[model samples]
Target: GSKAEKTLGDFAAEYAKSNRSTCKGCMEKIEKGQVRLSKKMVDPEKPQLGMIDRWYHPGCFVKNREELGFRPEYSASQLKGFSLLATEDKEALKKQLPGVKSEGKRKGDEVD
Candidate 1:
């Protein structure tokens, strides 16, 4: 049986309201006026690590989009703009997403 799909979480896209934001996945600055993806995360990786709203460039998000299910924010409403993201399919983009979660006990990734 296949493992359950991973959650991408609540997502929204718009011009970067400020340059203060960075792509959590890419570690690159999300330039203002450029479209970016933002997510609502209930689960925090670390409480002391503080909290960060998951944000990504459209190119980055779609790159790492495999196994990720969008929350109601994007799903309920039609996802508006993505001229950059549309260039690649979900699987193709998955690799480009940062710090990909490991699939449990796969052949090549198996433990000795």
Candidate 2:
């Protein structure tokens, strides 16, 4: 099965955009298709959830960990606001206000 889809716009809105192209340690453009790992799961992929970032690929990011200036993890509640039903369907709204927080909490959180 294909992995869930995501985009740069998805990340840019919630997280701060860094102009720094260098990998901090390796000095490279945090290329696309990079696998970022963190103690917390920033983007939940069903079954599991937690804090992650848009860091460089494992190889480069790990090597330059110190220079990257990593920070504390983010909670699931903190990221809930960024979730979208479908990127293509809502791309325009998201693009207009990339970091705009979505109204209301997850359905699971609604009162009984």
Candidate 3:
């Protein structure tokens, strides 16, 4: 989204203009040595689009994803029914939810 905020005048100075290999996220000038992510190209027919045109530092996207609560362990669709309710409502929902596992084991299963 920050990329969209840059004006046309700024684009000329910051963007590669002719060069396709550039980092769109951070607006940092990139060279052969810069690290990039291998992402699927928007246009499947054109393989060049899949090429790492826009790159970010290893942790940049990860940090953003985490901030946005996008975790690898949980699918976005699975969280749709989940809502932030009051404490009592949360406890009720927890009980109603299927396949909900408790943190502690049964009495016989406890570590001696």
Candidate 4:
């Protein structure tokens, strides 16, 4: 009764360490130093393979958000490794948060 399970999203975000990885959505190379997203996946047929991270471009992630298991209530901060993202990258991710119509044209910041 003391053991409580930690239930969290399988998604994560981080900068690409290398350009070798490809996006699962576009099947295009993920350039180095760019912010990317990933989801944990397991091989049903090959149990020995265990779980693995499936990478995707941030834009691509939004396009196929639900299918990738990102729930409607999911938030950018809920993603693993989000704390490690750069400030600019964090803003970028938030601007693309799923379940919202956030793709509006950029505008000047409000000031008092």
User: Global lDDT of each model?
Assistant: 0.52, 0.34, 0.32, 0.72
For candidate 4, the TM-score is 0.70
- Tens-digit lDDT track of model 1 for 1-112: 7532233234555567799888866789989875677665543556564544678776766655553454332331223332234334332333334322343423565556
- List the candidate 3 regions with Cα displacement exceeding 4 Å: 1-20, 41-53, 66-70, 74-112
List residue ranges in candidate 1 displaced over 4 A.
Answer: 1-9, 42-52, 70-112
Local accuracy of candidate 2 as per-residue lDDT tens digits, 20-55: 333433445654332222222254344344444443
Q: Which candidate, 2 or 3, would have the higher lDDT against the true structure?
A: 2
Per-residue alpha-carbon lDDT of model 3 for 11-107, expressed as tens digits? 0111122334554446554554333322222433465555322333333433343433343333211222233334553344234322212423234
lDDT of 4 at 23: 89
Candidates ranked, most accurate by TM-score first: 4, 1, 3, 2
Q: State each model's C-alpha RMSD to the native.
A: 11.7, 14.7, 18.2, 7.7
In candidate 4, how many Å is residue 26 off?
0.6
- Model 3's alpha-carbon lDDT is 0.32
Count of residue pairs whose backbone atoms collide, per candidate: 3, 6, 0, 0
Measured by lDDT, the strongest candidate is: 4
Cα lDDT tens digits, model 4, 1-112, are 4631111457788789999778888889998988888888884446688887878998998787877766645556567788688888788877777323243222344341
Off by over 4 Å in 4: 1-9, 43-50, 98-112
